[PDB]
């Protein structure tokens, strides 16, 4: 199963930085040494087994993207699953960006009429904090006026905080099929194991595939998933400095207990128990019961 994802945007908007940080295990300080992307850099990402993401890291320069809409129009915009257009919020040519975004939208509608548009308004860390909301809603009122042709969500991203993983989790959540089945599986696992919060990650990129939070969840932060993803990616890089693979995490807090163990061959599961009376050794094989069940299910199938 191949999904074709377009990564378009203006010159210097930061598309290769997002591709390197999310998929190629870069950090934010290492993207300053990234060179210019000449034409299109095709990337194949093995994400959740049989599903393969075709990432088309297109060049953002003007002579490249005049060539994209004229000669390579049939090669690029045909069979497009997700179109990602990246907007630099510190760009002084936003009216020049809107016309090019309209041209890319017109080519995408004329070639692949069943596609989803994501407008990532990048470089939000260069905007001061109290102005970081009403500026973004200023652009979000424009692009949603522009993008009435297809389904479009606009997200404010930056590589120096947790919003990048939220945006890329929202991007790859639509590409994963049968997500109500995984949501029902996580709901039944949290009901069976008496867990407050069950979050399923990916093994390599650590993007949040699915999550389920019960009413007994002690966490009140709405941006906790991408924060935990950043935590486990930083610790995976710390383990990879020692040439070792992180396998299991166990915690016993004052009122909680968090367990990060591998679930499938391509996932990690975070299980949080809100009851301190439940020991670690009960939950650490309560997860293994479901792991043995899905191994027995996937052995026959």
């Amino acid at each position: 199963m191949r999904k074709k994802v377009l990564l378009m945007g203006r010159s210097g908007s930061g598309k290769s930085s997002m591709r390197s940080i999310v998929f190629s295990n870069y950090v934010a300080k290492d993207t300053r040494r990234l060179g210019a992307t000449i034409d299109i850099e095709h990337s194949h990402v093995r994400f959740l087994g049989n599903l393969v993401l075709n990432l088309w890291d297109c060049g953002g320069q003007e002579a490249f993207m005049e060539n994209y809409l004229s000669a390579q129009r049939d090669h690029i915009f045909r069979n497009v699953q997700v179109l990602i257009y990246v907007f630099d919020v510190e760009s002084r040519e936003f009216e020049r960006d809107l016309v090019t975004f309209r041209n890319c939208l017109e080519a995408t509608v004329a070639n692949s009429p069943q596609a989803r548009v994501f407008c990532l308004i990048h470089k939000m860390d260069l905007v001061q904090e109290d102005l970081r909301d009403l500026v973004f809603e200023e652009r979000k009122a424009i692009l949603l006026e522009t993008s009435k042709d297809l389904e479009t969500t606009c997200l404010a991203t930056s590589i120096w905080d947790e919003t990048l993983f939220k945006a890329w989790s929202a991007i790859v959540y639509t590409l994963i099929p049968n997500t109500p089945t995984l949501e029902s599986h996580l709901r039944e696992f949290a009901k069976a194991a008496e867990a407050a919060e069950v979050i399923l990650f990916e093994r390599t990129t650590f993007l949040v595939i699915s999550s389920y939070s019960s009413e007994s969840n002690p966490a009140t932060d709405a941006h906790r998933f991408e924060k935990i993803s950043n935590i486990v990616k930083q610790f995976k890089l710390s383990c990879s400095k020692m040439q070792a693979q992180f396998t299991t995490f166990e915690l016993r807090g004052g009122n909680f207990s968090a367990f990060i163990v591998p679930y499938t061959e391509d996932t990690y599961i975070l299980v949080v128990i809100a009851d301190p009376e439940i020991e670690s050794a009960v939950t650490l094989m309560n997860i293994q019961s479901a792991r043995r069940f899905i191994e027995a299910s996937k052995s026959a199938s």
């Binding site: 029902s184 599986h185 039944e188 696992f189 069976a192 194991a193 008496e194 009376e277 439940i278 020991e279 670690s280 050794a281 009960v282 094989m285 309560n286 293994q288 019961s289 479901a290 043995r292 069940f293």
Partner: protein, 160 residues
């Protein structure tokens, strides 16, 4: 899936004055569930009791694991070698007597499957006694708790 509240309700009815604590743990000392005679109301009165029960289970699992590699069954009952071939025995009860208490470690033979929810470590039932406790009543309580926990854990391998 194992419900520790079900195990606590199952072991709460087998607790008297002479038997303060009944706990279920693994051979590595990892505690699963435990009960007590009096329920503490203070937080620290729960914490020191939980630390004491965890230390008791941690020492008792290693004290069971020291004796599990010894087979004294050929050194009794002089008969033919087929009887010795029928003597593949595993430890199932262990009673330790002190001045100010008694300890009983019994391995719970879990049914269902040989690899259902344990990786070659049987669950151990730890029964703590006192000076006025009697060891024969502890064996009856141990076999009742074993035959109830085994039927309770016979429905393991819970799906999704």
């Amino acid at each position: 899936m194992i419900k520790p509240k079900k195990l606590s309700s199952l072991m709460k009815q087998a607790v008297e004055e002479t038997v303060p604590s009944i706990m279920v743990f693994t051979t590595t000392g990892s505690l699963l569930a435990y009960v007590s005679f009096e329920d503490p109301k203070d937080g620290l009165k729960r914490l020191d009791l939980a630390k004491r029960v965890r230390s008791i289970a941690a020492l008792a699992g290693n004290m069971y694991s020291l004796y599990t590699a010894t087979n004294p069954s050929p050194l009794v009952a002089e008969s033919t070698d087929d009887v010795i071939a029928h003597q593949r025995d595993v430890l199932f009860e262990t009673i330790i007597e002190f001045e100010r208490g008694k300890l009983l470690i019994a391995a719970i033979s879990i049914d269902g499957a040989e690899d259902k929810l344990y990786s070659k470590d049987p669950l151990l039932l730890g029964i703590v006694g006192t000076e006025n406790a009697k060891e024969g009543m502890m064996q009856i309580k141990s076999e009742l708790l074993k035959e109830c926990i085994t039927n309770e854990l016979s429905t393991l391998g819970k799906p999704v």
